[model samples]
Target: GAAILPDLGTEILIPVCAVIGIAFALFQWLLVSKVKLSAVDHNVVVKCAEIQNAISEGATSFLFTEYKYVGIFMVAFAILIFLFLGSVEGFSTSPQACSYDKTKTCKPALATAIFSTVSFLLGGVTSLVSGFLGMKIATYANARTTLEARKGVGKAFITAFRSGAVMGFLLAANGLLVLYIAINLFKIYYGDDWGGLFHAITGYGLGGSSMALFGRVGGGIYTKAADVGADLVGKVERNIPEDDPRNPAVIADNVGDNVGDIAGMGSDLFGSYAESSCAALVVASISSFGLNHELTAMLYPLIVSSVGILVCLLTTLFATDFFEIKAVKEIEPALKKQLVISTVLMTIGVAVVSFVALPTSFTIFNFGVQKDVKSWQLFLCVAVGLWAGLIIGFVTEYYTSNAYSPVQDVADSCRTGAATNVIFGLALGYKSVIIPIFAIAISIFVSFTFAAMYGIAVAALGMLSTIATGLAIDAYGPISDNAGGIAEMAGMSHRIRERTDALDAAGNTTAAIGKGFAIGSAALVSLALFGAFVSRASITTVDVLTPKVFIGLIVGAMLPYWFSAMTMKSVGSAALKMVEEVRRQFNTIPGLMEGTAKPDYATCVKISTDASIKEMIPPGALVMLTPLVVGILFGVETLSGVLAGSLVSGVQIAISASNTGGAWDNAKKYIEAGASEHARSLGPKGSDCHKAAVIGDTIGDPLKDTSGPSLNILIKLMAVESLVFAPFFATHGGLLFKIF
Candidate 1:
């Protein structure tokens, strides 16, 4: 009998289940802790808080240590293993075999199994080196650092553990919040009348994943444009040194390149690939069932998701230790080599596993004996997986290394070049409007055409959008960072010359967070669109072109914008509190005159960390909670939707957040330089002032420029999928059912 798990009423069950599960887990954890560990000598509340803090710090340290090597390798391996599993399944089944019986048969299973077994073996070997060996090297390095820092091993371990926990908690919390908002909003907007509309709005406000990509790219372009116009042009006349305080150009360079570059590139390269890999796993599961038996096909998603989560947690731990090790004076060069080798080995292990387990009922090849082999050939299956992984890795590294500088450079060149032509025309007494008109026309033509093409290609649209958004945001980074950097240099220079405070720490955190919002918002918008398309699609085919999905698409696009606004507000509130504390402390100093207090770097660091915790942690926790809650209340179908949405949202948000921080840092230098003149002229008064306070109003431009277009990309991709995949799924009575 076909198992039927309730209907509409079943939806409510998911939340109940989640609550029960969470409570049970909590109880179990508490019981274990109380029974096994000694009671704290301190007050219970204080002890608990201390424990929490310790855990968070340790987790963070671990994440930082293994982040570059083991962390990267884990993500990479997960992607490769899944890709290999999917490719083999896809190849084994013929495109013509649409029906369940035609796709899933005994012959296909045997072949797939053999191939998958081989891949699994290879993947295991690789994991040993990457996960275990890599960690060993990182651990050694961390121990050496602890000794050099004059800290005992116990203290170091405690710190590392706390940091890792903190990072994990933040990540989980943010994910949960996003999921909660998404699910609640969907239910209210698309569900029954009894559901509160205000709740839906509130849900969106809390945290939505719509604007992730757009905000990043737009911010980058805005920063880049300002850099070229202000910094590069200003430098031509000033002859300011690259690190000089008087040079506006140097400051601009940092803002446009460093901040914008990181925000746009990191998210696009790492987050997008991760999301895509997950999606591929879903696709592979369908293909696997079609080629082999249902049991064989079911293993892919199960193993992949499980392994991915585990690897992520472990790598994060290792990475934190690695970062701590790097802080030591005598760093080992050999550690880097070991890390790289471990990654390679892990990748190979994953590949072997995938190849061996794959079913092979059908044969793509026509050779006599090989005809019995699955459509997915052994060599081809492994080759495709390797190729995909390599491409993703290369792309990630390239974007990270280049920091998307070329994009900003080109955009700035175009904008400046056009302005120059217009100015020249005015000086020569020609039609000044002609130059501006031509430039506008050219820009419109290029942007629109490119956007249109990107919209049509659903799979590649996200990438295209990232590139476009990056170009736009990069223009702003160099200018912002350079400005701040130059100001700092000048202040330092003046302080050395006069033996007085000159420059203040200015706009560092604000710039970074702003860019983060922009990039995150853009990516969110795209994910929303994608979700809508997927939701509206027919069960059988992938065709998404339909009026039914339009509402969902629009809703998704708006999510990121709402979430970004909320995040900004949250961060601002926390930052203000920190600022007040600094102000109070400064005022108490006996020698410090009124308005003579300079921006403190230590204060800035503390405030930044606090802001990050407040803005990101709560939201992340909510995201983690959503799926568990939804699963308990809504049954599997709704749970599936929520899970998928959360996954997409997570990828988008991570990318945006990472990039924005980088972009802001880049711009900080530029803002510093811009304020140097005042510091030199006014002495004590100058030390407390910043150029960002004067021109800070202009920050909104980059936010819109970088995020807006990125949103467009997400929308277009969703639109394409809706037009193509939705209908196909519907006609075939759902892809999952067909395979079964």
Candidate 2:
């Protein structure tokens, strides 16, 4: 019988897909390089490059400085991993009996402990590399996009989209390559022991989320600090012009966008990719796939990722090469098309994989029991998740888009007052959560009903199938965002700024969509990871009504708000100083108001940098330490309750806050765009209507950028972190209760 999928499919396809992705990224960068400034644009090019260097230097400095601390924490955490897991079998050197199979031998407990730590560090470093790589691409392309905007909106769009592809492909490729490398490397020791190998491999996702927690939290705080003050002082009161070089806070805003939205988002999404993949593998390890040592089957998750690269590669061509956008209306539609095309293509791709890789029927492990399942049934589990991503995108767009009634109502609310606009936005945000959550719930039900945790894990993977395209779409916003900043700072023509702003506006939606995707998938990933943790921790049942579980649930629900308060307060605290810095230059310095005296941009930059980097620590510590504290002292059942509580409570707030921030942003744009007298009647920049809208936008800064988006990390970090520490928690935990 012919194998539709060859036996060596994973080994060959995985690395090859990664290489192609990296190569495609390089090809796109070459196209971007073609859009450099002409000789007639000498001064414009020089000034743009000058501003770019400052931004590039500033962005790198932040990552390098931040990563240094994370790297140190990495080693310390590695030590903890080694100690806790090593204690599980009392550092025994003897080979253990196989839990998955009686006939096979298991590796020594000491070997498992040492390697898990090794994998964690490896994963941590790789995650760090992935974030910085995105930053590098964005910083390189932001100014180029600005220069290209002088040519035409079409040219600028190409530059921005191409640069975005650089990030998307590079990251997707990087993730696939690193994961493959980890498995092969770790497999040498745990040869034929798929259960132990995948168990150790779970550290990869743990590493990614751990590093990304800092990226989102630290990066979000950095952006919101300057973005808020710059909006109020620069956009509303001073009216110095958005992203104007004359405004001291604008550069800080630029740096923050890269740190938070681009690089930070890069790591954040990659963490999702890596985590979902790992979760699927972990649950599958004890199933028929692991027991049989089926090379293609055990690596089914990576195979989905492999084919996704090919599918997204083709999907990127439709946007970059196939279509042309002649009007502003085309921008959002084009982005939506990327998602549509990728999902449709990925569907076909996964179907082909299911047929070839799997037999007509297979047994999957379900809560320690084997159940016969058809290959087509398993495919439905992943496909349900795939469609749910599409559903989340449209639902998110309806709530956040200015063209829609929800956001328009928020815009219309500005006519009354800032308070009214904010209330409307809040109500809209609360309303926004309904559809997406239902979609997630449906996906969960379908996947969970079919194959237990493995199905749910794959469903998470299904949503992230077109991660390259998703990342490309997400990465485009920050580059164009920085491009707008570059155009303003370099004092380019209004037409150039307009072009970049349009591109950035669409990019912002995708980033919002990206967050929506992240939040929804984080729910699935957290649950699957939680389910896996429950199994690993040796807890048969974690009853919800129990006092331990109930209290943990309450505390878990509170964590998101507590984390939100910390981040919201940090941004406010930083913004207070940021606003004062800009006000100082304009009010006191002679000729500064006249545009003759230059402001101290460096001081404003320093304030946000120092403030965000420091403030991210406590919240991050809270996320990392919670599972350890709860599991070690209170035990596994309580930790299980915490995971469920956080996922349920954190997700609603996450969606509400993220959507609210986006809705306010959309409404602010509506007033700013006031293209006609009729439109302007609602509010122009200096009018009360416009002022009210500005107030809401300012309030939304930390809501979307800091607390809401970062909450995804809050849920995921704890879930995956708990899963990684599961063995130890099962063995040495419950000291307090045990003593009693």
Candidate 3:
């Protein structure tokens, strides 16, 4: 294999780009620091600061409690990975045939087993840090956004967007840096067995998704419990404004934004990035690049990611500095522009990286044969995914954004009642899946035709290439939401609340757009891993006609619905406690509604925290245990069907649920904002129409936040888990059948 860029250049370039991303993040943090809270509106500043402190403290404590359990699980799971993988060869030190090339000898299976566990732990710790840092930035910046809102919408938007950029760059840069270091460290031991080296490195992705599953489930339950509780009693029964100081669950609601949207979402996307990069590396390991010892070509996915960080850095300027958002209507467009700019820039970057890093032509592993692939064809593989992400983003925005007819139509349906509002929102969500599914299908076809499994893996990486900007826009939404919460709780004027609301509304649409990217990338990554698992387990085909495969497929398809039921019920149960507590406070405490007495916020916070920690275990267990149960009880062939079935069934539900929930939330906001004649006709906050929209929003709370986003992890996690444990399953599995 020959490459235009030398191996040494590729190595240095990745770290340099990572460092640049770090420096840019720090610069953004410095920019956020310049917005001092004490400058103007002294009383409002004091109130905002106190509210920020409460939110930050609540977020920190909840995470500490949540992490305590997650950390324990991490260690126990790591030991299991070691035990299972090591026992594959009975802990022997003897070398074995390369899994990719039967004629070549590779490292000891025990060595791969031990190293895989280490990588798993490394990935888990990194994912935890990613979420923790994201939570800190969001909690730190929320109040600043509130203060900036006093000046103008433009000022507040800049402050929130800058803070989001900080988290975005940090997570993207850190994920890249860690993966790069892991590859080099692993190379030291498996110097000649590239197949064995990458095969072990797959644990990194497993570790990430494992942690992410818990984060999304736990955080989602915590946030939605408080949100639904607060909305039901405060908005519907008492006719009070959202985030009212009189509401006991308000602080918990604000904290939920940090834990659920910021921390949970950050970890979720981190998993996506790690999984895509790992998938690409695993496939490239057996191809010509690893076989011929072409280090530069084998690390193509990392090079694309490195360039993406830089491209996103340039793209961030367009939102923060290049253009000013002076009008409320301009906000959504500004966020959408980030997607377009990053996609366009990353395309050029991917082409350049493809030109320099990959050989002009190479052979990719196609089942058992070496299939020829051209450099330009691989470029198209990635480009197809890159553009597919943009289309998904835009389509998601159309369905969720109030500027579009779909969401507006849903809002309009509220005039009749909550029932119609829900019907419209549900229909809109289902309709929204059409274009994105098509986009994903087209990219899959194009990439698979170009380079087989390797193409699919690169395509997944391509979809996540602009992850920095993707996270920035995503993180911005929650920061803006917390700002709105603070404005209402701090007793800021209605004008200020209006500004924060505008920012929050845009944030909602962008959040949905972000979810769109996550679900789409998860689909590609899962399919790619599914392909890799088939190869690793040495299964030639997954025929649907076989009874074992058919059973697995049907069961796999049901897993998402089963998973959603658990999450949705968890939120409902937790919210019941929160609602009862809020009602108890309202009914028992005198002067609470009249503003002479304060509600018991600590009790509400405690309810959500305790419930989330306890409720998260079962759903999490389901996701983690499904692959283990199926793989061991059946075999890799059945497990393959399970993965394929889950991927197919999960993506549709994930997309629709997220968008439907998003549309409802935005429709409620639209009614609250009353910016237009039709919006104002929905009438002041307490109108029947407003109450109906609120109900829709409350119902949607769990759908979008908890179960919908989490299903992405379910599909991706099961696939990666199956891939990681493939050798063990192939050897020791099908016990039930054997016994029979």
Best by lDDT: 3
lDDT of 1 by residue, 450-501 (tens): 2221111112212211221121122222222322243234332342211101
Tens-digit lDDT track for model 2 on 1-740?
22356657668988998898889999998888886653225898989888888898889989998888888888999899888889999988898888777888998878878888877887788888888999999999999988878877777787888889999998889998999999999999899888889888988888888888888888888889999988888878886677877788888899988888987788888889889999988877888778878778878888888899999989999988888887777888888999999999999999988888776766777767897777788799889998999999999988887767888789889989999999999999999999999999999999998888888999999999999988988898899899989998998888887787678767767877999999989999999999889888888887899998899899999999999989989999999999998898888888877888888878888999899889989998999999999999998989999999999999999999998998898787777777545447876667788878889888988998999998998998899889988888888987789999
User: Which wins on TM-score, candidate 1 or candidate 2?
Assistant: 2
TM-score of 3: 0.99
TM-score: which candidate is best?
3
- Sorted by TM-score (best first), the order is 3, 2, 1
Q: Tell me the TM-score of each prediction against the true structure.
A: 0.35, 0.98, 0.99
RMSD of each: 18.3, 1.6, 1.1
Please, what is the whole-model Cα lDDT of each candidate in the order they appear? Answer: 0.29, 0.87, 0.93
Residue 500 deviation, candidate 1, in Å?
28
Model 1: runs farther than 4 Å from truth? Answer: 1-297, 301-347, 362-545, 589-657, 666-740
Better of 1 and 2 by lDDT: 2
Cα deviation of 595 in candidate 2 (Å)? Answer: 0.8
- Scored by Cα lDDT, where does model 3 land? 0.93
The better candidate by TM-score, 2 or 3, is 3
Local error of candidate 3 at 231, Å?
0.9
